[PDB]
Amino acid sequence: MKFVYKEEHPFEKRRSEGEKIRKKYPDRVPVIVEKAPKARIGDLDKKKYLVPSDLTVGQFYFLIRKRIHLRAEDALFFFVNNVIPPTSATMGQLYQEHHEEDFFLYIAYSDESVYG
């Protein structure tokens, strides 16, 4: 997976804003959400999100679901560093285990449990 956000913004600019997001909103974590390129589902309007540290993946799912207007029958998986986070886990946990050196958490989403 190759996030277009890392190509749209130079690193040092991302590392800068990621620091200021964390500073001003310590109760929230900055997340970038893009879709796996082969995945067959709708695209997301925006890529950069500010998520409470206590929000669960399931809630982020249903948020991402109705933002993509996805039905309950349809599948939707998260991938942070090519692993599927457990659906009853907080974003704050995921940030402190997987945030990158620009201080963003990167999450790919797909309709399949293994993407390509």
Coordinates of N, CA and C in Angstrom, one line a residue:
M1 N 0.8 -1.2 0.0 CA 0.0 0.0 0.0 C 0.9 1.3 0.0
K2 N 0.5 2.2 -0.8 CA 1.2 3.5 -0.9 C 0.3 4.6 -0.8
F3 N 0.3 5.3 0.3 CA -0.7 6.4 0.6 C -0.4 7.6 -0.3
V4 N -1.4 8.1 -1.0 CA -1.2 9.3 -1.8 C -1.0 10.6 -0.9
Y5 N -1.3 10.5 0.4 CA -1.1 11.6 1.3 C 0.4 11.8 1.5
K6 N 1.2 10.8 1.5 CA 2.7 10.9 1.6 C 3.3 11.4 0.4
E7 N 2.7 11.3 -0.8 CA 3.1 11.9 -2.0 C 2.6 13.3 -2.2
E8 N 1.4 13.6 -1.6 CA 0.9 14.9 -1.8 C 1.5 15.9 -0.9
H9 N 2.1 15.5 0.2 CA 2.7 16.4 1.2 C 4.1 15.9 1.4
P10 N 5.1 16.8 1.4 CA 6.5 16.3 1.8 C 6.5 15.9 3.2
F11 N 7.5 15.1 3.6 CA 7.6 14.5 4.9 C 7.6 15.6 6.0
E12 N 8.6 16.5 5.9 CA 8.8 17.4 7.0 C 7.6 18.3 7.2
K13 N 6.8 18.5 6.2 CA 5.6 19.2 6.4 C 4.5 18.4 7.1
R14 N 4.5 17.1 6.8 CA 3.6 16.2 7.6 C 4.0 16.1 9.0
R15 N 5.3 15.9 9.3 CA 5.9 15.7 10.6 C 5.6 17.0 11.4
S16 N 5.6 18.2 10.8 CA 5.3 19.4 11.4 C 3.9 19.4 11.9
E17 N 2.9 19.3 11.0 CA 1.5 19.4 11.4 C 1.1 18.3 12.4
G18 N 1.6 17.1 12.2 CA 1.3 16.0 13.1 C 1.7 16.3 14.5
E19 N 2.8 17.0 14.7 CA 3.2 17.4 16.0 C 2.2 18.4 16.6
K20 N 1.8 19.4 15.8 CA 0.9 20.5 16.3 C -0.5 19.9 16.6
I21 N -1.0 18.9 15.8 CA -2.3 18.3 16.0 C -2.3 17.7 17.4
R22 N -1.2 16.8 17.6 CA -1.1 16.1 18.9 C -1.0 17.1 20.1
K23 N -0.3 18.2 19.9 CA -0.1 19.1 21.0 C -1.4 19.8 21.4
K24 N -2.1 20.4 20.4 CA -3.4 21.1 20.7 C -4.5 20.2 21.0
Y25 N -4.6 19.0 20.4 CA -5.7 18.1 20.7 C -5.0 16.8 21.4
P26 N -4.6 16.9 22.6 CA -4.0 15.7 23.2 C -5.0 14.5 23.4
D27 N -6.3 14.8 23.5 CA -7.3 13.8 23.6 C -7.7 13.2 22.3
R28 N -7.0 13.6 21.2 CA -7.4 13.1 19.8 C -6.1 12.7 19.1
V29 N -6.2 11.9 18.1 CA -5.1 11.4 17.3 C -5.3 11.7 15.9
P30 N -4.3 12.1 15.1 CA -4.4 12.3 13.7 C -4.3 11.1 12.9
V31 N -5.3 10.7 12.1 CA -5.3 9.5 11.3 C -5.5 9.9 9.8
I32 N -4.7 9.2 8.9 CA -5.0 9.3 7.5 C -5.6 8.0 7.1
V33 N -6.7 8.1 6.3 CA -7.5 7.0 5.9 C -7.6 7.0 4.4
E34 N -7.0 6.0 3.7 CA -7.2 5.8 2.3 C -7.6 4.4 2.0
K35 N -8.0 4.1 0.8 CA -8.5 2.8 0.4 C -7.4 2.0 -0.4
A36 N -7.4 0.7 -0.1 CA -6.5 -0.2 -0.9 C -6.8 0.0 -2.4
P37 N -5.8 0.1 -3.2 CA -6.0 0.5 -4.6 C -6.9 -0.5 -5.4
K38 N -6.7 -1.8 -5.1 CA -7.5 -2.8 -5.8 C -8.9 -3.0 -5.2
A39 N -9.1 -2.5 -4.0 CA -10.4 -2.7 -3.3 C -11.5 -2.1 -4.2
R40 N -12.7 -2.8 -4.1 CA -13.8 -2.4 -4.9 C -14.9 -1.9 -3.9
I41 N -14.8 -0.6 -3.6 CA -15.8 0.2 -2.8 C -15.6 1.6 -3.1
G42 N -16.5 2.5 -2.5 CA -16.4 3.9 -2.8 C -15.2 4.5 -2.1
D43 N -14.8 5.6 -2.7 CA -13.7 6.4 -2.1 C -14.2 7.3 -1.0
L44 N -13.3 7.7 -0.2 CA -13.6 8.6 1.0 C -13.4 10.1 0.5
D45 N -14.3 10.9 1.0 CA -14.3 12.4 0.7 C -13.0 13.0 1.1
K46 N -12.6 12.8 2.4 CA -11.4 13.4 3.0 C -10.5 12.3 3.5
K47 N -9.2 12.6 3.5 CA -8.2 11.7 4.0 C -7.7 11.9 5.4
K48 N -7.7 13.1 5.9 CA -7.2 13.4 7.2 C -8.3 13.5 8.2
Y49 N -8.2 12.8 9.3 CA -9.2 12.8 10.4 C -8.6 13.1 11.7
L50 N -9.4 13.6 12.7 CA -9.1 13.8 14.1 C -10.0 12.9 14.9
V51 N -9.5 11.9 15.6 CA -10.3 10.9 16.2 C -10.1 10.9 17.7
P52 N -11.1 10.8 18.5 CA -10.9 10.7 19.9 C -10.2 9.4 20.3
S53 N -9.3 9.5 21.3 CA -8.5 8.4 21.7 C -9.3 7.2 22.2
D54 N -10.6 7.4 22.6 CA -11.5 6.3 23.1 C -12.4 5.7 22.0
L55 N -12.5 6.3 20.8 CA -13.3 5.7 19.8 C -12.8 4.3 19.4
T56 N -13.7 3.4 19.3 CA -13.4 2.0 18.9 C -13.4 1.9 17.4
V57 N -12.7 0.8 16.9 CA -12.7 0.5 15.5 C -14.1 0.3 14.9
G58 N -14.9 -0.4 15.7 CA -16.3 -0.6 15.3 C -17.1 0.7 15.0
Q59 N -16.9 1.6 15.9 CA -17.5 2.9 15.6 C -16.9 3.6 14.4
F60 N -15.6 3.6 14.3 CA -15.0 4.1 13.1 C -15.4 3.4 11.8
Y61 N -15.6 2.1 11.9 CA -16.2 1.3 10.8 C -17.6 1.9 10.4
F62 N -18.5 1.9 11.3 CA -19.9 2.4 11.0 C -19.8 3.9 10.5
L63 N -18.9 4.7 11.1 CA -18.7 6.0 10.6 C -18.2 5.9 9.1
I64 N -17.1 5.2 8.9 CA -16.6 5.0 7.5 C -17.7 4.3 6.7
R65 N -18.5 3.5 7.3 CA -19.6 2.8 6.5 C -20.6 3.8 5.9
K66 N -21.2 4.6 6.8 CA -22.2 5.5 6.4 C -21.6 6.7 5.6
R67 N -20.3 7.0 5.8 CA -19.7 8.0 5.0 C -19.5 7.5 3.6
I68 N -19.3 6.2 3.4 CA -19.2 5.5 2.1 C -20.6 5.0 1.7
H69 N -21.6 5.1 2.6 CA -22.9 4.6 2.3 C -22.9 3.1 2.0
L70 N -22.2 2.4 2.9 CA -22.0 1.0 2.8 C -23.0 0.2 3.6
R71 N -23.6 -0.8 3.0 CA -24.6 -1.6 3.7 C -24.0 -2.6 4.7
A72 N -24.8 -3.0 5.6 CA -24.3 -3.9 6.7 C -23.8 -5.2 6.1
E73 N -24.4 -5.7 5.0 CA -24.0 -6.9 4.3 C -22.6 -6.8 3.8
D74 N -22.2 -5.6 3.3 CA -20.9 -5.5 2.6 C -19.8 -5.5 3.6
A75 N -18.6 -6.0 3.2 CA -17.5 -6.1 4.0 C -16.7 -4.8 4.0
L76 N -15.9 -4.6 5.1 CA -15.1 -3.5 5.3 C -14.0 -3.8 6.3
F77 N -12.8 -3.7 5.9 CA -11.6 -4.1 6.8 C -10.7 -2.9 6.9
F78 N -10.1 -2.8 8.1 CA -9.0 -1.8 8.3 C -7.7 -2.6 8.2
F79 N -6.6 -1.9 7.8 CA -5.3 -2.4 7.7 C -4.4 -1.2 8.2
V80 N -3.8 -1.4 9.4 CA -2.7 -0.5 9.9 C -1.4 -1.4 9.9
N81 N -0.5 -1.0 9.1 CA 0.8 -1.7 8.9 C 0.4 -3.2 8.5
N82 N -0.5 -3.3 7.6 CA -0.9 -4.6 7.0 C -1.4 -5.6 8.0
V83 N -1.9 -5.2 9.1 CA -2.6 -6.0 10.1 C -4.0 -5.5 10.3
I84 N -5.0 -6.3 10.7 CA -6.3 -5.9 10.9 C -6.5 -5.7 12.4
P85 N -6.7 -4.4 12.8 CA -6.9 -4.2 14.2 C -8.1 -4.8 14.7
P86 N -8.1 -5.2 16.0 CA -9.3 -5.9 16.6 C -10.5 -4.9 16.7
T87 N -11.7 -5.3 16.3 CA -12.8 -4.3 16.2 C -13.2 -3.6 17.5
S88 N -12.8 -4.2 18.6 CA -13.1 -3.5 19.9 C -11.8 -3.0 20.5
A89 N -11.2 -2.1 19.8 CA -9.9 -1.4 20.2 C -10.0 0.0 20.0
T90 N -9.3 0.8 20.8 CA -9.4 2.3 20.7 C -8.4 2.8 19.7
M91 N -8.7 3.9 19.0 CA -7.8 4.5 18.1 C -6.5 5.0 18.8
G92 N -6.7 5.5 20.0 CA -5.5 5.9 20.8 C -4.5 4.8 21.0
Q93 N -5.0 3.6 21.2 CA -4.1 2.4 21.3 C -3.4 2.2 20.0
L94 N -4.1 2.2 18.9 CA -3.5 2.0 17.6 C -2.5 3.1 17.2
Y95 N -2.8 4.3 17.6 CA -1.8 5.4 17.4 C -0.5 5.1 18.1
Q96 N -0.6 4.8 19.4 CA 0.7 4.6 20.1 C 1.4 3.3 19.8
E97 N 0.7 2.4 19.1 CA 1.5 1.2 18.6 C 1.9 1.4 17.1
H98 N 1.3 2.3 16.4 CA 1.6 2.3 14.9 C 1.8 3.7 14.3
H99 N 1.8 4.8 15.1 CA 2.0 6.1 14.4 C 3.4 6.2 13.9
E100 N 3.5 6.9 12.7 CA 4.7 6.9 12.0 C 5.5 8.2 12.4
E101 N 6.6 8.4 11.7 CA 7.5 9.5 12.1 C 7.0 10.9 11.7
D102 N 6.0 11.0 10.9 CA 5.2 12.2 10.7 C 4.1 12.3 11.8
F103 N 4.1 11.4 12.7 CA 3.1 11.4 13.8 C 1.7 11.2 13.4
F104 N 1.5 10.6 12.2 CA 0.2 10.2 11.7 C 0.0 8.7 11.8
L105 N -1.3 8.3 12.0 CA -1.6 6.9 11.9 C -2.2 6.7 10.5
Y106 N -1.7 5.7 9.8 CA -2.1 5.4 8.5 C -3.0 4.1 8.4
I107 N -4.2 4.2 7.9 CA -5.1 3.1 7.8 C -5.6 3.0 6.4
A108 N -5.4 1.8 5.8 CA -6.0 1.4 4.6 C -7.3 0.6 4.8
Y109 N -8.3 0.8 4.0 CA -9.5 0.1 4.1 C -9.8 -0.6 2.8
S110 N -10.5 -1.8 2.9 CA -10.8 -2.6 1.7 C -12.0 -3.4 2.0
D111 N -12.5 -4.0 0.9 CA -13.6 -5.0 1.0 C -13.2 -6.4 1.3
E112 N -11.9 -6.7 1.2 CA -11.3 -8.0 1.4 C -10.4 -8.0 2.6
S113 N -10.3 -9.1 3.3 CA -9.4 -9.2 4.5 C -8.0 -9.3 4.1
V114 N -7.6 -9.6 2.9 CA -6.2 -9.5 2.4 C -6.2 -8.8 1.1
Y115 N -5.5 -7.7 1.0 CA -5.6 -6.8 -0.2 C -4.4 -7.0 -1.1
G116 N -4.5 -6.5 -2.3 CA -3.4 -6.6 -3.3 C -3.7 -5.7 -4.6

